[PDB]
Design a protein around this ligand. Structure first.
Ligand code: 2TM
Ligand code: MG
Ligand code: MG
Lengths: 51, 717
RNA sequence: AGUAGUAACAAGA
RNA sequence: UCUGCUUCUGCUAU
RNA sequence: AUCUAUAAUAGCAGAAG
């Protein structure tokens, strides 16, 4: 969480090179979900050993 | 610049950097599915190399058996299984003529071995085919199941405890009308042919974690009816191999390197100055698939000439059983339907009455080629040795072909000698010119062809004498160090903290001694092992910050201790090891530096993490508290009925050890039952105690009365 | 999909 | 329905 | 000087074929 906070310059993620045999919206949603859950357990500042 | 590590060989000879060519830092290849494909392909290759042989039907099993002996001499350089019996007998005769008395002395020692060996020897095996369950089981479990079934069928010669009496029981079991299997209680009855096929079966599995191979292959494990005979035959062949200078077996390690160096040195000394000397680094192709059991029988019959007949019989049974052996096909296959999204297991036992539409091209061809041999889910495999089952006897055959290379047998100007380890071989050829070298190589190759040995042309090469490779030992005017091969031995072993420390440090030291591990690299290996150990066991230095569940106790113990240098690494202490003290254990290395209370706690006589033995008074423990026992999870099938049998077994064995103090130090011997031995021991002990004066009238009477009660209970259940 | 590579995993009871 | 045989080496003591 | 051996407890781990 701290190492991510050291970076300013986040944008809205968009697909640049798709996985031609996969479902790329799923990857976009997975990254959005990672960001959302990180924001969740950071807003708590009760950060477990595992999420 | 483009980095090319291989270019390092332009200045450093390949031998002096051979360790670079061994990529043993990555994981080895494993098998994922079934081994039926490799088993069927092995059977088909074995029958292809011997296809010009004679087909027969076994009157006892009903299996089609192929006999390539004395078949047509090969016409090409493809692998051939057509060994000529007269050439094998000539090789044996000339080996005995060149080393007078080798077979006689070997047979004497092997007679002693056969008469003294106990049936317990069979328990020294790994996963064994168990015909009672038709599955792989630990060797001791398979042997116990076999003994129980034999006893319930009236076969009880194995009660003598001798291996040869158990072999007599096996011989008599192969003559019964029906075999009774009593499971848990379902009473199954095998008939003669079914029991016979189960007794001649070798289960087949795929070999895992194998380096140097792109493709997987099959290994075999025989049942208990085969293993005693194979053990006696291998003991005879080992006695023979010990007396031969060309044998790379059973010598291993530093002794093997010394023997190879000395023998090659003597060979170069014997070669005259005017002669041309060449060396073949040679492999043999399809070694086990072309080693015929009939030729092993011929070899054993020639070796055991003028011996007692019982000895010849007991040594002849293993080649006979291997000549009529069956290879179990394995787990079968797995079928998937994508459209229905389902998967199913098809057993191997239904691979003869199945539709071929389900299979791809190559598997369908395999099944079509192997179907005539299928009986009860096994394939008839008369030719072949089925993967290193007679390593030492095949070594003897190869050494006989090497021995045929003296000038008294070549009768020409060229001659040859060398080293033979089962299939691997180093052949030194001497001749006055290059044409003589070619003639000697051709003659050796064709003589090998005559006895079923096929030199691998693509894996073998020849050069002027002085450099060669033998059994992954690289010889450049002397054997070089190859450290990479011993690389997987470095690391945490997973026994416990004490044992892992001991193993890590000892491995580093022995690699300094044997594998040219330099001192600086040894110090770095020590550092890396300590890092991996501290990570694995959560025992980082007390004065650190790594966060773990153990770190609080370690910090408390650290701050509590005056002399920190005495704490063990597992207790968060420092690492005091260096090149100086690798041979010294860790508790002894820092015994002087320990605090008295920490020392008396670590080595407390009533340590609760180790087992205590009764003398409720118990002996004092000696080991430290770092010698704890790791929980072994063994919890989803129907084979849960043996957990109670094993528990009661353990109860009985602990009681016996309470009656016999040395039973766990040395293996106990005796034909008497457990209750009889324990009661007689209790009686004689009570007698010599009342006599010498440790017990009185009444205690002696009570002990004798309990003994009489137990004896009437054993006679009267 | 992916791992993987001559047969499997992508949970099973 | 799944780590075989053989040889060497190392460690440990249910 | 010899010494797998004028020898034989067992289990596990590594290597080789
Ligand atoms: N694990 C092992 C490895 C080897 N062995 C024994 O060593 C022989 C040569 O193996 P090898 O591995 O040299 C045969 P390879 O060179 O792969 O192929 P090729 O036969 O086409 O030449 C086998 O046939 C077995 O007797 C064993 O019993 N267990
Ligand atoms: Mg070779
Ligand atoms: Mg090879």
């Amino acid at each position: 969480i701290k190492c991510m906070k050291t970076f300013f310059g986040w944008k809205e993620p968009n697909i640049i090179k798709p996985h031609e045999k996969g479902i790329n919206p799923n990857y976009l949603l997975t990254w959005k979900q990672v960001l959302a859950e990180l924001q969740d357990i950071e807003n708590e500042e009760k950060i477990p050993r595992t999420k | 610049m483009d980095v090319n590590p291989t270019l390092l060989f332009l200045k450093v000879p390949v031998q002096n950097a051979i360790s670079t060519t061994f990529p043993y830092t990555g994981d080895p290849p494993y098998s994922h599915g079934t081994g039926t494909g490799y088993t069927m392909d092995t059977v088909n290759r074995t029958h292809k190399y011997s296809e010009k042989g004679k087909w027969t039907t076994n009157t006892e099993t009903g299996a089609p058996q192929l006999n390539p002996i004395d078949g047509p001499l090969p016409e090409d350089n493809e692998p051939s299984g057509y060994a000529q019996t007269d050439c094998v007998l000539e090789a044996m005769a000339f080996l005995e003529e060149s080393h007078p008395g080798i077979f006689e002395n070997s047979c004497l020692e092997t007679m002693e071995i056969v008469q003294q060996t106990r049936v317990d020897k069979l328990t020294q095996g790994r996963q064994t085919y168990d015909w009672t369950l038709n599955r792989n089981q630990p060797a001791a479990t398979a042997l116990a199941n076999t003994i129980e079934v034999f006893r319930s069928n009236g076969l009880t010669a194995n009660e003598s405890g001798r291996l040869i009496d158990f072999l007599k029981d096996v011989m008599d079991s192969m003559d019964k009308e029906e075999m009774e299997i009593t499971t848990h209680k379902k009473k199954q009855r095998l008939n003669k042919r079914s029991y016979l096929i189960r007794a001649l079966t070798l289960n087949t599995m795929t070999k895992d974690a194998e380096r140097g191979k792109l493709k997987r292959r099959a290994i075999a494990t025989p049942g208990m009816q085969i293993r005693g005979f194979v053990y006696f035959v291998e003991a005879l062949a080992r006695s023979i191999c010990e007396k031969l200078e060309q044998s790379g077996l059973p010598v291993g390690g530093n002794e093997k390197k010394a023997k190879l160096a000395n023998v090659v040195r003597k060979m170069m000394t014997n070669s005259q100055d005017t002669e041309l000397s060449f060396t073949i680094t040679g492999d043999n192709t399809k070694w086990n698939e072309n080693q015929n059991p009939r030729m092993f029988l011929a070899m054993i019959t020639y070796i055991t000439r003028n011996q007692p007949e019982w000895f010849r019989n007991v040594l002849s049974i293993a080649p006979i059983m291997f000549s009529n052996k069956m290879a179990r096909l394995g787990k079968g296959y797995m079928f998937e339907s994508k459209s229905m999204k389902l998967r199913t297991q098809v057993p191997a036992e239904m691979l003869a009455n199945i539709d071929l539409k389900y299979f791809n091209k190559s598997t369908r061809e395999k099944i079509e080629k192997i179907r005539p041999l299928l009986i009860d889910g096994t394939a008839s495999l008369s030719p072949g040795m089925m993967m290193g089952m007679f390593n030492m006897l095949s070594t003897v055959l190869g050494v006989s072909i090497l021995n045929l290379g003296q000038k008294k047998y070549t009768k020409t100007t060229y001659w040859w000698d060398g080293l033979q380890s089962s299939d691997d071989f180093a052949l030194i050829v001497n001749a006055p010119n290059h044409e003589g070298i070619q003639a000697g190589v051709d003659r050796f190759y064709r003589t090998c062809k005559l006895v079923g040995i096929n030199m691998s042309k693509k894996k073998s090469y020849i050069n002027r004498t002085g450099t060669f490779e033998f059994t992954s030992f690289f010889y450049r005017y002397g054997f070089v160090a190859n450290f990479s091969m011993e690389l997987p031995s470095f690391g945490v072993s997973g026994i416990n903290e004490s044992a892992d420390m001991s193993v890590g440090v000892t491995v580093i030291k022995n690699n300094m001694i044997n594998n040219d591990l330099g001192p600086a690299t040894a110090q770095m290996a020590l550092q890396l092992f300590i890092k991996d150990y501290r990570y694995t066991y959560r025992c980082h230095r007390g004065d650190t910050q790594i966060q773990t569940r153990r770190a609080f106790e370690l910090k408390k113990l650290w701050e509590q201790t005056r002399s920190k240098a005495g704490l063990l690494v597992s207790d968060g202490g420092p690492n005091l090891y260096n090149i100086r003290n690798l041979h010294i254990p860790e508790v002894c290395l820092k015994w002087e530096l320990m605090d008295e209370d920490y020392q008396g706690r670590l080595c407390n006589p009533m340590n609760p993490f180790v087992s205590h033995k009764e003398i409720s008074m118990e002996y004092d423990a000696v080991a430290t508290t770092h010698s704890w026992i790791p929980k072994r999870n063994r919890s989803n099938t129907s084979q849960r009925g043996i957990l109670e049998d094993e528990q009661m077994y353990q109860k009985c064995c602990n009681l016996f050890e309470k009656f016999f103090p040395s039973s766990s130090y040395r293996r106990p011997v005796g034909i008497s039952s457990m209750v009889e031995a324990m009661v007689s021991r209790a009686r004689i002990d009570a007698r010599i105690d009342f006599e010498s004066g440790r017990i009185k009238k009444e205690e002696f009477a009570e002990i004798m009365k309990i003994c009489s009660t137990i004896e009437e209970l054993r006679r009267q259940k």
